[model samples]
Target: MAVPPTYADLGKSARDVFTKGYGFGLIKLDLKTKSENGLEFTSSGSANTETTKVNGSLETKYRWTEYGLTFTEKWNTDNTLGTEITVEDQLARGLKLTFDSSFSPNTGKKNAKIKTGYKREHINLGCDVDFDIAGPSIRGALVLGYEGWLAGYQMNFETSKSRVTQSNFAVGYKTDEFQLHTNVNDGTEFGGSIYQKVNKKLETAVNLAWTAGNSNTRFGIAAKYQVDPDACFSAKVNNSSLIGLGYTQTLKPGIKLTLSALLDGKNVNAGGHKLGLGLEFQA
Candidate 1:
């Protein structure tokens, strides 16, 4: 799934995988299969513009802990690694602060130090085709997403094509009995989503999200049961929610697999249900 062309060129699904704790891609790249990658390309064909949809996207990401600090590095299909510089501000005890910024330099352009093998430079708007190849989500939070698995919650912040940015501050207290997770985002309105573990084998969650920039209020619910320690079949059905049904499985000690069928309910792109596949691993 570390492959790039699959995601940027085809708008394909992601390989299911999530990493917890400090980890990095230590296995051989050849072991990474094509069936596990995200979309290969971004979608853009004007009414009268002769378009040629290309293929192949290169993507690689690594995150590891160092002296209580977090560092993550990412590269796209173009072989250009997107760099994000972050500064942290610790408020009281349990409170923290962070500011992050990234740069893509040139997209869909001649291969530079960053865009190693990319033919094109940019995708829709300012997003790189290589980036869109690896990932096409216009706006979303990639911070602390792993907490979703720890507490049996799916804390997501997704947005549409616009100039709106979001910030989230969530807290989760977990125990053997159950867990509670909450999320907050800055968009059209200040809203939040929550999830609860009803029992050992059952979990449920509801989301009330709004997109002022996109003009929508989304509501959704999900339920999942633990069928196996490494896998739990789950389904999310939302009125305006982004519904997904998938499972998680551990392929090895540091490698895992995640597969889900995504239904982009509100933002209808052409037709049919949106599909997603994700692969995750840790060193």
Candidate 2:
């Protein structure tokens, strides 16, 4: 038996199929390298097609396996500096503690958070606290698994309000080839997703969501196919008549490229179409 995943990842399989590869109207690039002494560096940049604005980030990380410690530092073009420190399996087996902080030099603003996670054979638990000028807020999640069935709950509490600000519950059944998940968010929205591996090269997923009192509902279906060892294709469509397509190819040993598009299915001549390009290199 294995410990269940975190609450936030209940429907990750279906969600990723519909959301992961489509970066419409954007050109993105990512580069990564690792030094001999154990330092890893990464840089990413993105440009929007409709605007002249460009965004970028640089990050560096180092890990010490003997002491179970990891450190990360990041800088963004928006003049924010962020850092994170993590300790894993030091206090107990399957236990992790993390401290994350961000500071804006231009605005003189700062944010800090502390998070802890523990996992066992059949249960997983995580908690985080966010520090704010007004008051600190806390969030916690717990998941229990029995065989292939999983159940989880998550809640967020605000000290200033003295109440639970948000709460959600999820249940899931998973196997090697199929998965079914359902969740209620904040006691308002209901959502369900299903994922199935049809064969060796094809997989499919469906998602449906609706509000408690609203008659309007949302639905989406997606499929992914492995064209070859180095190429893949994915397609998704939603109730709003929006369709997305993505293709990924491995150009070289450490180089990859992705192309994505979003099109209006109902109004083909309306001219509301988007395209995105992405490239990644690692060494």
- State which candidate has the highest lDDT: 2
Instruction: Report the alpha-carbon TM-score of model 1 versus the true structure.
Output: 0.40
Q: Which tens-of-lDDT digit does each residue in 1-283 have in candidate 1?
A: 1211211222111011111110121111212322222222221111111233322333332222221233334444444444332222223222222222244555543221111121111111112212333232332222121322321111222233433344444444333334443444442253334445577777666555666676767666667778777776777766745556676678887566655565576665646654434455443
Worst 10 residues of 1 by lDDT: 11-20
* Candidate 1 wrongly placed segments (more than 4 Å): 1-74, 78-190, 210-217, 241-243, 251-255, 263-271, 281-283
- Candidate 2's TM-score reads 0.96
| Local accuracy by lDDT, each model | 0.38, 0.91
Q: What tens-digit string does per-residue lDDT give for candidate 2 at 8-104?
A: 8888888877877678999999999976546899999999988968999999999887788889999989999999999999989889999999999
Predicted structure with the largest TM-score when compared to the true one: 2
Clash count, predicted structure 1: 42
Per-residue lDDT of 65 in model 2: 71
Model 2 Cα displacement at 269 (Å)?
5.0
The TM-score values for the models, in the order shown, are 0.40, 0.96
- In Å, residue 160's CA in model 2 sits off its true spot by 1.2
